[PDB]
Every structure is written in structure tokens, then in C-alpha cells.
Design a protein around this ligand. Sequence first.
Ligand code: CN3
Ligand code: 8PE
Ligand code: HEM
Ligand code: HEM
Ligand code: HEM
Ligand code: HEM
Ligand code: UQ6
Ligand code: CN5
Ligand code: 9PE
Ligand code: AZO
Lengths: 93, 93, 248, 50, 126, 54, 385, 55, 123
Amino acid sequence: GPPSGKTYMGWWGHMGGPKQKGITSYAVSPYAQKPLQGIFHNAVFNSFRRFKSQFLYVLIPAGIYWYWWKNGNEYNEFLYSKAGREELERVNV
Amino acid sequence: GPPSGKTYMGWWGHMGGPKQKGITSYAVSPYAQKPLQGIFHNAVFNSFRRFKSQFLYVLIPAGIYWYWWKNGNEYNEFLYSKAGREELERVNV
Amino acid sequence: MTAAEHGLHAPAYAWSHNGPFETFDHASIRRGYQVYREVCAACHSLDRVAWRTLVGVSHTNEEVRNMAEEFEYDDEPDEQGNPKKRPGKLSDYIPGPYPNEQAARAANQGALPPDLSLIVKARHGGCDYIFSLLTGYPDEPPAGVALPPGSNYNPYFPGGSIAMARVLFDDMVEYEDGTPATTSQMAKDVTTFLNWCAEPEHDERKRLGLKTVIILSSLYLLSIWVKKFKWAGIKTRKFVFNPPKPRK
Amino acid sequence: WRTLVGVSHTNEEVRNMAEEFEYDDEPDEQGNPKKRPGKLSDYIPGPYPN
Amino acid sequence: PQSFTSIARIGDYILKSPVLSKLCVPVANQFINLAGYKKLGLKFDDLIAEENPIMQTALRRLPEDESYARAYRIIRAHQTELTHHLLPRNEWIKAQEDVPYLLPYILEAEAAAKEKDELDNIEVSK
Amino acid sequence: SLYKTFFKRNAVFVGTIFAGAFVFQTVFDTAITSWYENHNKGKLWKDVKARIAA
Amino acid sequence: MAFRKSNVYLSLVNSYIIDSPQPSSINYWWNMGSLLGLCLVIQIVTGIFMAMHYSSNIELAFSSVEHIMRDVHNGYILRYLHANGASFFFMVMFMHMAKGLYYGSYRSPRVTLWNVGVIIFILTIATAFLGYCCVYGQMSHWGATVITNLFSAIPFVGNDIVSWLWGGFSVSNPTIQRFFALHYLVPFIIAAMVIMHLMALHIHGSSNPLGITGNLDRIPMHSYFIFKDLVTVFLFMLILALFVFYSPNTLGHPDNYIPGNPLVTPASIVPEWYLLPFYAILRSIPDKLLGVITMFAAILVLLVLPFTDRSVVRGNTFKVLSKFFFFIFVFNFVLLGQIGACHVEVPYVLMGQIATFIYFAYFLIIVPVISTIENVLFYIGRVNK
Amino acid sequence: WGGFSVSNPTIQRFFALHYLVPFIIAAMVIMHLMALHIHGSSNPLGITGNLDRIP
Amino acid sequence: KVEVNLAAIPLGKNVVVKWQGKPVFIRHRTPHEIQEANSVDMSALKDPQTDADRVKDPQWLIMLGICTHLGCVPIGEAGDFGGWFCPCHGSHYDISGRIRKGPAPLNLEIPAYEFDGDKVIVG
Ligand SMILES: CCCCCCCCCCC(=O)OC[C@H](COP(=O)(O)OC[C@H](O)COP(=O)(O)OC[C@@H](COC(=O)CC)OC(=O)CCC)OC(=O)CCCCCCCC
Ligand SMILES: CCCCCCCCCCCCCCCCCC(=O)OC[C@H](COP(=O)(O)OCCN)OC(=O)CCCCCCCCCCCCC
Ligand code: HEM
Ligand code: HEM
Ligand code: HEM
Ligand code: HEM
Ligand SMILES: COc1c(O)c(C)c(C/C=C(\C)CC/C=C(\C)CC/C=C(\C)CC/C=C(\C)CC/C=C(\C)CCC=C(C)C)c(O)c1OC
Ligand SMILES: CCCCCCCCCCCCCCC(=O)OCCCOP(=O)(O)OC[C@@H](O)COP(=O)(O)OCCCOC(C)=O
Ligand SMILES: CCCCCCCCCCCCCCCCCC(=O)O[C@H](COC(=O)CCCCCC)COP(=O)(O)OCCN
Ligand SMILES: CO/C=C(/C(=O)OC)c1ccccc1Oc1cc(Oc2ccccc2C#N)ncn1
């Protein structure tokens, strides 16, 4: 077939990054390691900072929208009761 | 992606035949040719030899199968008439 | 909208089929059918329930044969082409009290009583709403409410004005097993019978769901162990950088 | 009946032909069945009930 | 999408103003420390998206001793990310090491592409 | 050794996970049905028919 | 070479799910795409087996579904897996698109991949609308009446598009028969778009949660991400089984168990939960022609994001202002779904109009302004001048 | 049959299968064209075509 | 099209048809209620409508009835002064349907009914 266009990823042996020189890596077989050494030292301290260094970007927008919905629901409940009957004709104009 | 397997056809520039040397070709533009010199000198002699040098490979098997079907159809017509009533009990045994 | 136009909220009762491991109470289903035949069936149809579905759930096989043989159905015409009748069998569906919709409205002052085969799943509230409607008729409406003639007050109905009157009173039905037939007992039994009419697969669905959840929970816990074993070489990999010599 | 108009008969000829047969109607306010003469939407009726 | 010539034009106007450099520069120092790329061992010029012709030109012209060190920082940041950890605190990038090493090569390639575009779509007059 | 008698020979490692799953179906279905009916005793139709015999 | 690389049909399998180079640092958010492939197979296979027992006439459609629930062996399993499986399909698709917004997957060189995905989202919405009509419950009839009447406000062609869509004068028997035939076809068009979606992905590969190049450290797909995919497949099936067997009517409306009546209007006309935010956008425009244009613009505005993002960094990982406004947009989408299930009453009318403005202002105002400011703060916090 | 003879469940399942199999045929045609692209077509002389091709 | 002839229609009972899927709440009027519609002037409602634009012919009262919003149906002869009422909305209907006895200001539709000589054709 015809050759393709120019991309930003290749294949094994010609992947297309920069040239590497001076880096050594080491690894050990999984058959020679301890079986399942995580629930502790990861539920102790690791799985608390991973979201509570991030919790303030979620809960400030969540508290704004929950305050807005709860305030509007109590005002609709007041308007259709007996005590809020006089305001109801005023705001449906 | 990965390279493919070995085939027997390539593409334009690397089609995969033998090396050519010594052959010259010539051609004329269709805009400078006569329009439709087709029906005569081709229905005169060309479109008769192209099938009547081939007609005997078709019409000998066609004549064998048409003789066989026509002979069997006349025998079935004889068996269900009045004159072929006596043979009909003999061959349905 | 106001609270009267939406209807009063129905509370939660302790039904014995609530829960992931519970079946129906089949003695309460059997008593509930007797309340249907003697009270409800004068005006309500049950069109999606066949006679054969009651066998092995609430009645024996020869009990249902005698029940279906008290009604007559249409038959194929005779050799001259005139229509005939025949008694019922187990293949037939339970018949209703009216021939068409116009005869149903003419007997109930223009109102149409609905078919009750799916009524538990077709209302918000479920079994709690059907039970609270039947036992929730006051002796008189609140002060100020003027009902049109031909309607009754019930606070659980949206709007408060319903076209059916109170039908359940104390000791109107004689039970076979000897249960006292108060208003609260008869409303509980017929709601259980109507829940089986809407969900006949209920006891089988919860048994098949227990086998599926146990198998899928084991495959989930095993896949976490296998993934963590096969990833341990990548997760503990280490890198070291030594800067190369120049002039090349 | 409507397919005969403009092919073999005029529009008021087919209206008179279909009005010599009676068809089933919707029941009344009590629920009893009624009859009505035919119209151009109806199909041509046959001689036997079944 | 926004060119680095446009970013440097706005940014150098703020830094020369004595009243605007007292307001925005304390806010920019808190913004970088909250970003957290230095705790993974990265400089800011490692984070620039590279799949465009201007960035491919600037990465070719980088000297090779700086190209080897950039490749080690990117590889170390991928390994730290998959373990859901941070680097030890003595291996964090300091503020005096977070220098724009790639920025002069980017600005030179952008000016040459602008001059070529102006000469290719051009008017004349007698 | 019990790796090489159970999981090495992968003519039956495909086989034993295909034959241990056959007898697994009947033992599992018998155990759950017995637990499910004992949890709901006194409510089934067979517990009702045993004293609506009259 | 090996046979998995030399064969014509196995090399497509090998380059996609066996030997394809993945970045080593992708997390569990990158598993949503393969769950969507499992959901499409589940919806197609349960669809064929139910269609062997279904009648599409308007006098027979409601009783055919009740015939499946009562008389077909394991027929209640087929329906409940089908109806609840459509809600799980939309939930995984919402999380898949929100992953792309957060990490900048829409940016170059992946614009064609993002554009094909927007076409898939439109065809999935149209599929679920047509299957809901085939029940012919009371919510099925009146939901089709409301939506098809919107197209009569189009100038000069509007009153003839609607009667060409009805086959008559209202929602009637030719409408239900043509809606079931279209409902069979569109999932096969969706399956062809998924193949075009996977071809564009093979060209450039996936992104990673750091936003930078992945060409320096790759691991192959087989036995690493195959076994990571098995963890989320079994968790998905377990939660789906808890809904099918233990609470099968929680995600539906009880008015759909009443047969369709064109003479009785229900007290409230509510769509399914995954179409509720687009229903609230439509009810916030008082003019009828501008309301249906704004309703379709809420999907087509996803195409402007490759041009309005001005940042020189891909993704939201190192940007604190873009993190804050992303979650403002997420909880605004939940509030619009809640407004769409309420009555047209004070103060829900004004609340829906403000939330509609915030939806469109995120794509066209907030993203280009915030990403320009974050470009300048990175510069002046480092450059000594 | 879905029953004891050719009856109503037979016709309803045969129409649903009749809708589906032409879409399986369309997928086999795509696999048919992929294998053809690898080697190309033959010619009526039976010999190699690599020496004279036209687009 | 629907063709019903004139003499068959009763006055106190309703001949509502679902013609083309529209519920059409119509009547034989007779003269006693052609002055039961000028008594409220336009001083309460937004449309420049009067009875001369309502009906062609005061003998026969015919107007079509779905719902300026969704389409519910009223109860017969239970209204405020000689009309109908769907409990949809507070939808109070007068004779020949002029709302603004509740929220909805727009009044709905007159069907295309045509005489060619003692033969009304609704359509
Ligand atoms: C709806 C039906 C579909 C059902 C399946 C869909 C699953 C959707 C869940 C959302 C998601 O895909 O992202 C998950 C993301 C965590 O991504 P991560 O790679 O950084 O965490 C790797 C971990 O450290 C090691 O995880 P590890 O591989 O070591 O163990 C696996 C873990 C369970 O993993 C999962 O099930 C993944 C869903 O097993 C255990 O917990 C052991 C004790 C039993 O979580 C987060 O980023 C934030 C957490 C809350 C997210 C909830 C938001 C939902 C709207
Ligand atoms: C037109 C279509 C519009 C589509 C809009 C879709 C809206 C539907 C709502 C889908 C919610 C999905 C939100 C999360 C999207 C995933 C992408 C993401 O936010 O990244 C995960 C985030 C980052 O965490 P890290 O900082 O540890 O990782 C950084 C990379 N190194 O880690 C987190 O912070 C995860 C926290 C997630 C909490 C989100 C709560 C959502 C609640 C929705 C409830 C809806 C039902 C009521
Ligand atoms: C124990 C006996 C009965 C039960 C359990 C029962 C059940 C029900 C239920 C569930 C409804 C629907 C209410 C709703 O729409 O929310 C209903 C409505 C109705 N029933 Fe009954 N029914 C019974 C007996 C009767 C009887 C004896 C009559 C008439 C004499 C009757 C006439 C009606 C009517 C007219 C309605 C419609 C009311 C309306 O729409 O306003 N029912 N019934
Ligand atoms: C992406 C694929 C699909 C989606 C999202 C989808 C969605 C839906 C939905 C939401 C319903 C209404 C369910 C309810 O609330 O009861 C439905 C009904 C139905 N669908 Fe599908 N569907 C899909 C594929 C198919 C296919 C391919 C077929 C047929 C070959 C099919 C056949 C049916 C039938 C027969 C019904 C009516 C029975 C019922 O109500 O469950 N579906 N569909
Ligand atoms: C039936 C529907 C779909 C299927 C089967 C599907 C499948 C996939 C798969 C398998 C991947 C690669 C793995 C992954 O990143 O999760 C992917 C990536 C992607 N998809 Fe989808 N997808 C679907 C719908 C969509 C939609 C609706 C959108 C957006 C509007 C979309 C946009 C993307 C993007 C941008 C990526 C690249 C993500 C990255 O590289 O970081 N897709 N899709
Ligand atoms: C819907 C059905 C089919 C379609 C659309 C189709 C399409 C095609 C096309 C376009 C070609 C190339 C042009 C040509 O040689 O005519 C081709 C070639 C071929 N087809 Fe088919 N085909 C179909 C069915 C079949 C069947 C039923 C057979 C044999 C049992 C077959 C065997 C072949 C072979 C051997 C060739 C190569 C011919 C050569 O190179 O000389 N195809 N097909
Ligand atoms: C970035 O690297 C990745 C990657 O991360 C992932 C996740 C994938 C994952 C791939 C997928 C998730 C595949 C996508 C899924 C599909 C294309 C599904 C398509 C759907 C179909 C083909 C439906 C067909 C169904 C049928 C034909 C069933 C028909 C029913 C029948 C025949 C009933 C039987 C009848 C009788 C009478 C018994 C990649 O391919 C990939 O490489 C690019
Ligand atoms: C170890 C596995 C265990 C469990 C995990 C996975 C199990 C499930 C298996 C997954 C199924 C296979 C993977 C998915 C797959 O192969 O499909 C995606 C690839 C399709 O795209 P494509 O190859 O680019 O298209 C195909 C293209 O690459 C080639 O072009 P072509 O299609 O030939 O065009 C011809 C059309 C002619 O068009 C015309 C005539 O106009
Ligand atoms: C419409 C979307 C299309 C998407 C295409 C995706 C590919 C789907 C294929 C899935 C895997 C199928 C495995 C094929 C088995 C190996 C192929 C083979 O055996 O070819 C041949 C034998 O021929 C056959 O019998 C074909 C069997 C028809 C297969 C139809 C399903 C193996 O012999 P060969 O040496 O020629 O293989 C090298 C080819 N380059
Ligand atoms: C047939 O009724 C279908 C409904 C449904 O929810 O289907 C799943 C439905 C029910 C009640 C009310 C409305 C209903 O349909 C719909 C349809 C709908 O469609 C769109 C969604 C996004 C953008 C444009 C449209 C349109 N048109 N948006 C909202 N509700």
C-alpha cells in the first residue's frame, strides 16, 4: 500500500522520542516478592493525603450549589402553604 | 504499526516484477484520434472468430444435455397416456 | 403545588416480603384472593392473570378447576355457524364484571375503575399507598372542604376527592383458617395478593440473584489479587542517572 | 368502496351503493351495540358470517 | 494556542511597572507552589506540549547534555506518578533551578516563522 | 509436586477448570436453595398445604 | 515472524489489544472506554432475543412487553437487564467524556477522535428515545407528543416535517411501527462509528495524566492492562446485578405501567434521568423556535473546545484555577437535571435560566479567559525582570 | 419452532433473524475486500500482472 | 373528514369525537346561550376575540378542545358559569372556552367545519 502521513508515535524500536544515554534501570521478579504488602502503609497515610490535598477544589463548589438548591426548595415550600398565600399572587404577576 | 508479511504485489515504484531494460512504448492522445472507428472491422470479422473458434467446447456439452432431457420428457409423456398404461405398472414395481 | 393537590405521604410498614432474602407469605396470598372474590370483583377486572398461575401458589389443582368452571366463555360456532358457550378451563383468563367501558362508567356515575393487575407497580408508594388508601377514609372531611355530590374524601388521593366509597368494614368476610377479619387484616391480605399479581417472578428472582451476587463477588476479589501480583515488577522499578561525558 | 371512484363510477354513485348495507357501530352510553349505513371508508361486504 | 511572543509581551509589561509587579508577582509565587510540579522533580519547560512544528524545531536545537537531563526528569516523573507517591524532599526542584532553558530557542523559531509568513503574502507598489 | 500435578499440564489446566465447573453447578445450587427455603420456613406453599389439608 | 503478526486478520487483533504500546502511568479513568464496548454488546444481544417475541402494532405493543415479563422463560431477566443496562450505558459515557475534558484529550493531534465521539453521543440519545416509545406506556405516548411538536416551529417546512414524522395527524399506529424499525438500525450505525473511532486512536495512541509525552516509557497491552481491565469489568457486572435482581424499578417511572391514552394527560411529564438536563435547558427559553435551537446547541458546543482553550499545557493537573471551574461545571450539570424534574414554578424558573447561562459561558467565556491568565502567571513567577 | 409446528412464534422469530443476517453479510464483505487488497486480482492469461498496471 | 348530519345531534348531551386524534367537545347550542358570551368584555383578556369571530352561525356551537399546553379533558357541565373544568391546572372553561379564569390566556382553536347544504363536515 501507499505510505501514511506523519504522526507523533511510532512502534517498538522506533517509538519517536529523544535519544537516551546514561540511565540504568533495575527490577526484581514478582515470584520473589512478598505477597500483598499494601493494605497497610497505604490506608494508614497514603489514601488520605491523595484526596485531602485535593478536597478543597471539590467541596467549595459542592457547598455553593447545595446551599443554592436547599434555599430555593424552602422558598417554594413557603409559597404554597397558608402563610405564603399573599406573596404568591404578587410574584406570579 | 508493525510491518506486514511477505506478499507477491507491491505498490507504484516497487511493484515487484523483474527488471526491465530495452523496451520502448509509444501512445497518442485520445483527443487527437478518430471518434468511434469501432462497429465496422469488428462486427465484420472480429466478432465472429472470437466465439466460433470456441463454439465447439460449448455446443457439444449443450447438445448432449438437451438430447437427454428431451428424450426423458417424451418417455414420461408416453407412460401417463392410454397407450403406455401397461408399461406403467411394470416400472413402478 | 399545595400539599392537598399532591396527596398525603404514605408511611412505611413492615411488610414481610421487604428485604433481599424474603419471599411472599403464601397464606396471606390465599386469604387475599377471598377478599377479591367477595368484595373487589363487583367492579374491578383482573385481565392479565390466567387461572393456571394460581396452582401451587395459593390453591391446589382441583380447587382452581372448580373455580374456573363457574364462568362461561365463548366457543367456536357449530356446523350451521351459530355461536355457543362453554365452561372455563385453566387456559382461560379471569373474567371481569363489565362487557365494555361504556357499561362500566354507567354503573359508577361516569367514573372508570381501573384494572388491578399492575396497580402496585403503577403508583408511587407501592404496597404502602394501596394499604393507606383503603384504611384511610375519615368519618367526615375537614372543615371547609365541599365535595361534589357523588364523591368521597380520602387524604391520600391527589386532590382529596375520590369516586370510590369506603368498602371494608369489620367482619364482612368469613375466613377458612379462622383469622379475625377486621378492616386492617383484610386490607393487608388483599395488598399482598395484588403484589403477587404484579410480580409473579418475585420469589424466583431473589433466589437467582443470590447465586449471581456470590459468584460475581468472588471474581471481583480474585481479580484484585491477580492484578497486584502481575504488576509488582513495574511498581518497584528503580532508575539511576549518570551524566555522560561530552565531545561526542 | 373509495377505490371505485374515478375508475368505474362517479362519487355520488358509490355513496348510494354503500348506503344499502349496514355495518357495526360503537356502542351507546349504556353499552348496547348499534348499526349504521355504510360509507366510502368501508370495505365491500360478503354474503356469509363465517 | 497563545504564542510565547504574546505571553512575553504581556509579562514584560507587568514586570517593568513598579505598581503592577507588587500586586501580581506575590500571586504568581503562590500559584506555582500550589501547582506542585516541582515535587515530582520537573521544571516548567518540561510541561510544554510538544506536538507542533515550532516545538519540534526548538527541541532539535537544544544542546545534547541538556537533552539527556530532560529525558531523565520525564521518566522519573512517570514512575513516581504510577506509585501514587511524591519524591523525597531533598530531591525537589528548587526555585533557583526552575529556569526557562527552552524559551530562547522557542522565541527564535517563532520570529522566523512570522517573517516567512509576511513575505509569502505581500503587496508591492510602484 | 503439586504444581506439576495440578496446573502444569495445560491439556487439563484448560480441562480441570472445564470439568471442576460441571460438578460445581449442582453442589452450589443445592446449598443455596436449602438455605433460602429454611430462612423462609412457614411461608412457602408446601408449608401452607401441610395444614390446609383440613 | 510469529503467526499473530503475519496473518491478515490476526495482525489487526495483535496491533490493537496485544502489542499496542500504552503509557505506563495511566490510571483507572482510562478503563471507561472498554466498558462502553461491553455495554454495546449487552444492549445488542438482549435486544435480538426480546425482538423474537415483540409486536409493534399500537393495539399490541403494551401487552407484548407484559407477555415477555410473564410467559417467556427468563423473560423478566432479558427486559430488566435491557432497561437497566441503558442507564448504565449513559453513566459510563458521561464519565468517559468528563475524563476527556479534565485531561485535555480533545486537543491536537486528537481533534478527529473527539469529533467522531460527539457523533456517537448524538446517535445514542436518538436510540434511547426510540426504544422508550416502543413500550407505549403513558409516559411513552406523551413524551413523543411533546418532542415531535417542537419541529413545527421551523419556518416554511415545519408543519410538513412533523406529519412526515407521524405518518398521519398525531402519534398513532404508523408512528410506533416506524419507530421500532428505526430502533433496530441505529445501533448498527453506532457500531460502525466505534470502528472509525478506534482507527483514529491507533494513529496517535492515548494521552496520560501528566499531560506530557509518553514515548519514553511504554509497556505492552497484554497481561498488564488486560488484567487491569478485568477488575473494572467484574465491579461493573456486580453493581448491575444488584439493580437487575434486587431493585429493578428504581431508575424508572411508575406511569409507564399504565397503557398509553391519548385522551388523558398525566399530572407530570418527566423524561429518564440521563435526559433531564437537556429538558431543563429547553424549558428556560420562552420562544418555541429559539428553545429547540438552544437544546441542540448544548451538544454541538462541545466542538468549540479545541479552539477556545488557549493554554500551552495539556490538562488540568497543574492548574488550580482550571480545577476549580471544572467542578463548578460538574455540579451545575447536576442542578440542571434536578430542575428538569420539577414543576414550572417560582423560583425554579429563574434558577434554570441562570444555570443555562453558566453551561454555555463555560465553553465560550470562562475557558479562554482563565487559560490566558494561567499562561501569564507561569511566566512572571519565574522570569527575573 | 418455539412450539409443536410452524406457528406464530416461528414467524415472529424468523422476521427478527431476517433483519440481522444482512448486517453480518456486510461485515464479511469488508473482510473479503481486505484479503483482496493484499494480493490484487488475477487476469485472464493466468500469469503475473506486475509488469503492466493501470490505476 | 367526519360527516354527521344536522338533525341527529342532541343539545344537553355531548357528541365528543376523537376526530384525527383530537377530542372535540361540541354541542347542539339552540339560541338560549348566544348572549352568554358578550357579558364579559375584552377588559379581562388579551385576545381581540368576540363571538362573531368565534362561530359562523349561532345555531350550532363547535370548537376544538386539547390544551394550550398538553391536552387534558374536562368534566361535563361542572363549571363556573355554564362551562367545563379540567382539574389539570385550575383550567376553568366557560361556554366556548375562554380561559383567563385560570392561568392560560390563549384560547385554542375552531375546527374547519363546512356546510354545503344541511351537511356539516368537520375537517
Ligand atoms: C457506574 C457503574 C460502573 C462501575 C465501574 C466504574 C468505576 C468508576 C470509578 C471511577 C474511576 O474509574 O476512577 C477511580 C479512581 C482511582 O483511580 P487510581 O488509579 O488513581 O487508584 C489506584 C489505587 O490507588 C490502587 O488501586 P489497586 O489497583 O491497587 O486496587 C484495586 C482496588 C479497586 O480498584 C477499582 O475498583 C478501580 C475502580 O481494590 C481495592 O480497593 C482493595 C480493597 C478492596 O478514583 C478517583 O480518582 C477518586 C475516587 C472517587 C471516584 C468516584 C467518582 C465517581 C463519580
Ligand atoms: C454534554 C455532556 C456533559 C458531560 C458532563 C459530565 C458530568 C457528569 C458527572 C461525571 C463526574 C465525573 C467527574 C470526574 C471526571 C474524571 C476526571 C477527573 O476529574 O480527574 C480525577 C481527579 C484528579 O485526581 P488526581 O489529582 O489525583 O489526578 C491528577 C492526575 N495526576 O480526581 C477527582 O477529583 C475525582 C473526584 C470525583 C468527584 C466528582 C463527583 C461527581 C458527582 C456526580 C454525581 C451525579 C449523580 C447524582
Ligand atoms: C377491597 C376492594 C377494592 C379495592 C382494593 C380497590 C382498589 C382500587 C384502587 C387501587 C383504585 C385506584 C386509586 C387510584 O387511582 O389511586 C380504585 C379506584 C376505583 N375504585 Fe376501587 N377497589 C375496591 C373496590 C371497589 C368497589 C366495591 C367499587 C364500586 C362500588 C370501586 C370503584 C372504584 C372506582 C369508581 C374507582 C375510580 C375512582 C377515581 O378514579 O376517582 N372499587 N380502586
Ligand atoms: C445501543 C443500543 C440500545 C439502547 C440504548 C436501547 C435502549 C432501549 C430503551 C431505553 C428501551 C425502553 C426500555 C424500558 O424502559 O422498558 C428499549 C426498549 C426495547 N428495545 Fe432497545 N436499546 C438498544 C438496542 C436494541 C436493539 C439492537 C434491539 C433489537 C434488535 C432492541 C430492542 C428493543 C425492544 C424490543 C424493546 C421493547 C422491550 C422493552 O421495553 O424492554 N434494542 N431499548
Ligand atoms: C460507544 C461509545 C464509545 C466507545 C466504545 C469508546 C471507546 C474508546 C476507547 C476504548 C478509548 C481508549 C481507552 C480510553 O481512553 O478509555 C477511547 C478514547 C477516547 N474517547 Fe471514546 N468511546 C466512546 C465514546 C466516546 C465519546 C462519547 C467521546 C467524547 C465526546 C469519546 C472521546 C474519546 C477521547 C477524546 C479519547 C482519547 C482519550 C485519551 O487518549 O486520553 N469517546 N474511546
Ligand atoms: C456479496 C457478495 C460478494 C461481493 C460484494 C464480492 C466482491 C468482490 C469484488 C469487488 C471482487 C474484485 C473484483 C472482481 O474480481 O470481480 C471480488 C473478487 C473475488 N471474489 Fe467476490 N464478492 C462476493 C461474493 C463472492 C463469492 C460468493 C465468492 C466465491 C465462492 C467470491 C470469490 C471471489 C474471488 C475468488 C475473487 C478473486 C477473483 C480474481 O482475482 O480473479 N466472492 N469479489
Ligand atoms: C489504546 O489502546 C486500546 C485500548 O485501551 C482499548 C481499551 C481497546 C478496546 C477495544 C474494544 C473495547 C472493542 C470495541 C467494541 C466493539 C467494536 C463492539 C462492536 C459490537 C458488535 C460487533 C455487536 C455484534 C453482536 C452480535 C452479532 C450478536 C448477535 C446475536 C445473535 C447472533 C443471537 C443468536 C441467534 C440465534 C438464533 C441463537 C483497544 O482496541 C485499544 O487499541 C486501540
Ligand atoms: C488476549 C485477548 C483476551 C481478552 C481481551 C480481548 C478480547 C476481545 C477481542 C477484541 C476484538 C479485536 C480487537 C478490535 C479490533 O480489531 O477492531 C478495531 C480495529 C478495527 O480498526 P482497523 O483495523 O483500523 O480497520 C481496518 C483497517 O486497518 C484496514 O482497512 P480495511 O478495513 O481493509 O478497509 C477496507 C474497506 C474498503 O472500503 C471501501 C471499499 O471503500
Ligand atoms: C467489519 C469490521 C471488520 C473488522 C475485522 C476484524 C478482524 C476480525 C477477525 C477476528 C479473528 C479471526 C481469526 C482468523 C483465523 C486466522 C485466519 C485464517 O485462518 O486464514 C488463513 C486460512 O484461510 C481461511 O480459512 C480463513 C478463515 C475465515 C475466517 C473468517 C472468520 C490462514 O492461512 P494463511 O497462511 O493464508 O494466513 C496468512 C494470511 N495473511
Ligand atoms: C418517547 O419519549 C422519550 C422520552 C425519554 O426519556 O426517552 C428515553 C421522554 C419522556 C418524557 C419527556 C421527554 C422525553 O424525551 C426527551 C427527548 C430529548 O431529546 C433531546 C436531547 C438532547 C438534545 C435534543 C433533544 C431533542 N429533541 N430530550 C429530553 N427528553
